[PDB]
Design a protein around this ligand. Structure first.
Ligand SMILES: Nc1nc2c(ncn2[C@@H]2O[C@H](COP(=O)(O)OP(=O)(O)O)[C@@H](O)[C@H]2O)c(=O)[nH]1
Ligand SMILES: [Mg+2]
Length: 207
């Protein structure tokens, strides 16, 4: 049975890399800030355990401000690629580096996916290696970043961390932690995916 994940967040936080970590393959292209920004979603899939994992990597364009002709059609494409709705939105942020631009990117997520999207969101912190083997929960307990605390609260405290450069059993271990977070979220939601008005329209147009 399908597990559908949509990656969201500020550009450069490591979301394409996180997609690669989850799928254990080079599904999405990571890039430096100097490189061209993306305008189209990319979709890839793989297996974890007995389950098909399907991931949509949202374009950098979804974080842009002001008028953008391509946005509406590509948001429609994102919905069509994730229908009947994502099980999880993974809001990707770099550990210790949550800024006003992250806050704004999170607002774009609510605009695109709806006010209630945080109820199916997990906050994924990249650069886990910066913890030096320390507890993520303890780090977040002591974090003084007020905007980050508010986001994490809106996401029901659901958090996880990746070192996207991890390999081997270290990679397996961090992906397992994310799957454990997803298991608990889905349990709370009786296995349901996120939905909204627009996802409903799509679902009701198919036989
Ligand atoms: N050290 C480190 N670098 C990372 C990590 N995740 C991503 N990167 C790097 O951060 C840069 C941006 O990553 P990318 O996947 O393109 O982020 P995106 O813009 O959110 O899709 C790339 O140079 C990645 O190699 C991480 O966990 N640790
Ligand atoms: Mg990317």
């Amino acid at each position: 049975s399908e597990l559908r994940i949509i990656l969201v967040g500020k550009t450069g936080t490591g979301k394409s890399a996180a997609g690669n970590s989850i799928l254990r393959k080079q599904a999405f292209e990571s890039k430096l800030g100097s490189q061209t920004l993306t305008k189209t979603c990319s979709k890839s899939q793989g297996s974890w355990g007995n389950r098909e994992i399907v991931i949509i990597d949202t374009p950098d364009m979804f974080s842009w401000k002001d008028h953008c002709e391509a946005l509406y059609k590509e948001v429609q494409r994102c919905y069509l690629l994730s229908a009947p709705g994502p099980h999880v939105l993974l809001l990707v942020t770099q550990l210790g580096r949550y800024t006003s631009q992250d806050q704004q990117a999170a607002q774009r997520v609510k605009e695109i996916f709806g006010e209630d999207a945080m109820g199916h969101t997990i906050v994924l912190f990249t650069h886990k290696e910066d913890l030096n083997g320390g507890s993520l929960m303890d780090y977040m307990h002591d974090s003084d970043n007020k905007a980050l605390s508010k986001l994490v609260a809106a996401c029901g405290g659901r958090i996880c961390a990746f070192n996207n450069r991890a390999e081997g059993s270290n990679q397996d271990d961090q992906v397992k932690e994310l799957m454990d977070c997803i298991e608990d979220l889905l349990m709370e939601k009786n296995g349901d995916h996120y939905t909204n008005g627009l996802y409903s329209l799509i679902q009701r147009s198919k036989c």
